[model samples]
Target: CVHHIKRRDIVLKWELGEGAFGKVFLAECHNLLPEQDKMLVAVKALKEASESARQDFQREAELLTMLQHQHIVRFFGVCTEGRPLLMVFEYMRHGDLNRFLRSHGPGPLGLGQLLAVASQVAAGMVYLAGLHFVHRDLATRNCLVGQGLVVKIGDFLPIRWMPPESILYRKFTTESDVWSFGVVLWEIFTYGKQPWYQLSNTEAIDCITQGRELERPRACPPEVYAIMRGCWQREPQQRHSIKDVHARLQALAQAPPVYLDVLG
Candidate 1:
């Protein structure tokens, strides 16, 4: 059974995005999660919905309830007992990782800070992998930034972050998530540059199938690039697991962090 929230108790603060019959907003909701009454939450509300449209909003809550992690977004509850079904998620202060990184100038985030982000994302993936769950949507775009430079994996899915087999054969697994994580690291070092940015969508897929990988990001330390390459290994079995990736990141964080910065 899903936790229920009364429709009247929800307050729309501002519009975040929109869909055909729905809108996402930064909303205020009360009497939900522990000790957090009167809290700001992300609302994906199907304001005018058919039962068909309601299923999408409902399932978002249902799926999120199965997950609970510091590095993952928190699902407060759902308001589906009536029309205008909506899902409540924890409010991420800094917003999505893509926008947060892009907004920053040439370089304020240090290597330690970036490695910590990678480690946190990997930690979340490691938890998912333990549950034998495949996060087909893992990517920098799907990651959110919280208070104090904390990055949590967020919701959203796309094609460019995927691995070759995920594109060519529809094969997705923890390994595929690992490949996506590599691209996320690339985005981190590049400060939110899109992967294969100049290439057309069709051309991007062709490049992947041709075994071409992304070049190292400017100022990305050599060893960090090596870890990304490890994740991009051609075969699924050849790729490192989330645990190994996390471990390497943690280890790297312990080392003295010295980077060339933008042009370095």
Candidate 2:
């Protein structure tokens, strides 16, 4: 069930930023979901409101409502009665992970927070895959950063992180998402640098097609680099599964080789 929020109740604060689709704003609205209270939201306002646009949103919300995860962005609903149709989603104070990483380089604990963030994303992916849903896009930009460096996946496009078959045949699967996840790991390690910052879209595509993958990021730990390379394997069958990646990331967080042996 979609929540129809009244425009009058919505108070636009300021533009957060513009995405490929529309301009997103930091806004305040009365919570319509259970436990009513003041709620902060990111309102994605369409540049052109039309019957087609409204229908498109409905399709999106249908998917959103089924998805519930701490590492996935929450979709509140929409305001169609207004001039520019709006999509309401939970607000992340720290905003997109890409910006947050660039602004705040790996501080005090180098691998500490970064590994936690990566593991959190995998936890969400494990849940999403269990539901048999494939995320068409998975990247640093698509992941929102909350306080404590928590990251949540958002809905968006794909490219640099796509596997060769996905790029050539437009095939997308859980494995394809794993490939993207590797690139995101690179981004996290590199302080939000673009995946193929040195190459154009075509060049990046060509690079992958020719079996060349992203270099190990300078600041990235060797352990994480291993995980990234595993995901960048030429064949989807050769790449690591989301569950494997999740375990690998979690293992990184517990670097000391935890051994909880039960005594007789």
Candidate 3:
């Protein structure tokens, strides 16, 4: 849609989803097909600012191109031929974790489908962290879940440019992302309720800044509850590394759900 892709570029199309960001349509790369195979892709068409958009557009394109990981959402490519900024990505049918959780109970992932999705998320983040990249915005709203509970972490707007030093301030490091991931773990536990939905974003920020504690998710076992709490520590150094997190969660996946006798 942007200055890079012409109107005639789209070969086949299907609606994927739409958001404030843009309208996403699924398409096939007919032109690229002879050189490769027909690929299913989702395109995000964003509003084009007369001039400044190119910077943001180019920045995201370059970032996506450099980031390659299975857990991180795949960036197929970009088409910037016209006024709209088009971002091509993997076509995800089930939307995000927010939609998937809201639609779960009546669907394939029943209550007993515990740990499966959670472990996959941990695996994905493990891969992302291995690349020294911080997801800055890890939440259910960003994770896409499909028929097999295929989980892929999407969305890249809230990225923090992390610096790997002694828990440096004013930076977006893996530790900060781990803090965000703890909130995500809470979402996974609560089936997608916003953290303290009764409060505004401002209030959530104030409370988080002031050290108001969060009770564990409704059905979370005590061990996992403790781990998630460790992640939410006010001090960044107190949080667990993704490596530690993956190991702990991996062990939990092997054990039966330990639905705690008391909610933490």
Candidate 4:
């Protein structure tokens, strides 16, 4: 059950990230039992937001509460009665995937570890797809990296990381999310490089329209690239479903590390 946490109980530590709706801060619940006092959390507090923004924030809260998956962030509770309305979640120690990758530099994790991370992400998407909800903004930046290389899908920001249909027709669907996930695969393979780094937004749209796809990253296994291509199919119906993608990644993770050149 979602409890109404008091504002005074949460000690805001530092800013994690910011979006138009509000800012996410790292916080500690001082009022919790001594056994749980060491647990840190992430608090998303509204910043004098308009009613529409507040509704959107509440919508996210509802969706999060509805979603209970290992690969998804855990929601603690909400502070609606407080001065600054806030939503609390389990804190990710490593932060966003992009930042985590950069901090660790190139080839931070070996092929096995990389594939394991991708598998976890696919697992999360499978859960979301089961609920028929589309994460319009699926990307490395939106995915949080937790301890033990755990990746949880969260934070749906506006624009950027959108698929061709979403960019042109503003249509967001499970299929579009597949396209975005393909880009995320690209990001992971490339060690956090931005998608289409060389192309401007217009150029990217034109290129994608002309049947251009991101090139496979250096040293990326052929099997993994095949799954990425499956997700990036131009036709939405042609793309692999999230469940299929998850299964493929799971098999890959269990495969002998020799195939990925990660074993001795």
TM-score leader: 1
Q: How close is each model in CA RMSD to the real structure?
A: 2.1, 5.2, 4.6, 2.7
Cα distance off (Å), candidate 4, residue 256:
4.7
Model 1's TM-score against the true structure = 0.92
Give candidate 2's error at residue 198 in angstroms. 2.3
lDDT tens digits, residues 1-264, model 3? Answer: 222334455554887778776688888764544566566767888866456777877888888777776666777667767657677777777788887776764243433355666777778788788888777767888788764667778777322111123223456778887777766777777777777777775565566666765676666676777777877777778789878887887787777464653443
lDDT, each prediction: 0.83, 0.81, 0.69, 0.80
Give candidate 2's TM-score: 0.89
Quote each prediction's TM-score.
Answer: 0.92, 0.89, 0.81, 0.90
lDDT of 1 by residue, 52-107 (tens): 66666666667788888888888788887666678888788887888877877375
Alpha-carbon lDDT of model 2: 0.81
lDDT of 1 at 185: 87
TM-score winner between candidates 2 and 4: 4
Error of 2 at 86 (Å): 1.6
User: Candidates 1 and 4: which is better by lDDT?
Assistant: 1
What RMSD value applies to candidate 3? 4.6
User: How far does residue 22 in candidate 1 sit from its true spot (Å)?
Assistant: 2.6
Global CA lDDT computed for model 1: 0.83
CA deviation > 4 Å runs, candidate 4: 31-35, 157-160, 256-264
